[PDB]
């Protein structure tokens, strides 16, 4: 008998594609061989970072009484967190804008 | 016919619906998220490849990915990413 197919993402409990990640690792000329757990680990890490940024962006959207996440919300999420800002320090986000800040010396009186 | 283009749009959308069931996302935001996912994938994969090369190994295993995550992600991001990766690999091996 032949067992029914089950995607490795569901086997690992992930939403991101373990198979696509494994294929990209194999095709990217990163190493001669790729271990079985490497794509699962990488998919899990990518999913974690995506979930973190998306939840922060959603909170930012809620604070602005908005229903959809736009690039401004992604920018606000990233730049209001030291760790994410350090991870994405040399990154430009299109239509993200900048954080509102005015140097204190410029204010009146 | 025309070539099919692959993207992380559907998986990003599933994660968004997991964390924010009622929140939507614009097309430009989804493009930014695709760019972010590709960039982090490239960073981690390159660091893992260099780790394997330095140690004269032909295989990128979960150890290389874990060390790349530790090197790249700062602070508590690294700890939580390592926890998630270890949990995922343990669940995958269990099944």
């Amino acid at each position, epitope marked *: 008998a032949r067992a029914k197919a089950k995607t490795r993402s569901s086997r690992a409990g992930l939403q991101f594609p373990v198979g696509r990640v494994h294929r990209l690792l194999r095709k990217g000329n990163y190493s001669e061989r790729v271990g079985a757990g490497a794509p699962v680990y990488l998919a899990a890490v990518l999913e974690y970072l995506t979930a973190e940024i998306l939840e922060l962006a959603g909170n930012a959207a809620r604070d602005n009484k908005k229903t959809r996440i736009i690039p401004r919300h992604l920018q606000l999420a990233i730049r209001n967190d*030291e*760790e994410l800002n350090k991870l994405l320090g040399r990154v430009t986000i299109a239509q993200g804008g900048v954080l509102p800040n005015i140097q204190a010396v410029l204010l009146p009186k | 016919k025309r070539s099919r283009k692959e993207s992380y749009s559907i998986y990003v959308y599933k994660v968004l619906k997991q964390v924010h069931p009622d929140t939507g996302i614009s097309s430009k935001a989804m493009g930014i998220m695709n760019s972010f996912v590709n960039d982090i994938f490239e960073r981690i994969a390159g660091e893992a490849s260099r780790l394997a090369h330095y140690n004269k190994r032909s295989t990128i295993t979960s150890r290389e990915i874990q060390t790349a995550v530790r090197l790249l992600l700062p602070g508590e991001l690294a700890k*939580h990413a390592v*926890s998630e990766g270890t949990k995922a690999v343990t669940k995958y091996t269990s099944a």
Partner: single-chain antibody
Amino acid sequence: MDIKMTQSPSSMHASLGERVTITCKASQDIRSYLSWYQQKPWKSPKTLIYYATSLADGVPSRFSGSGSGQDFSLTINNLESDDTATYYCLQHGESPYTFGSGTKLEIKEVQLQQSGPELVEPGTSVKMPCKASGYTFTSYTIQWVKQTPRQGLEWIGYIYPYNAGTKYNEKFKGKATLTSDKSSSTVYMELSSLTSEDSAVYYCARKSSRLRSTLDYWGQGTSVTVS
């Protein structure tokens, strides 16, 4: 509106070696953002479980956390004389963080310096520091918690030294004000117009900006008494 947190076993008794199960229920979904703490009498609480399953640093595997959604539980397998303490569940899935009612159990380097006890007359104001060391100061928020025998633990607010952003509990808005000084690596908690009910013990606790992180290291606490 605020998430009321219910711990069914208000108190319990046990002997050595046997198992214990403490349940904590949420009035709304919090998606596994639950933390468990152990507080010895006259000591700062210590973290046991965070994210409802993860074991905190330095905690033995005797403690086990489980649950998701609105039902959560804490389990201790091999009890010891060291396990005599009060246990609280903390949810931080929504802006006003709510502690559990508490559960009394009896068996038959990061550092946050805090000032000593202070006596103040009603109507004045007090400023209690919280000097932190042993980690990157800007990368972690400093949470503030008020503990009373009547109302138990209550979350006041936090300040993020990275950008000086603050979030206050609606109950303590106006009453409490938070400020930070990056040069001295110190965070200050200001209480205005002291009342009789404001007499309590105030803890400052470190929390990372990460969503699943919890209050991991606590200050010894500053006991404030109002005549």
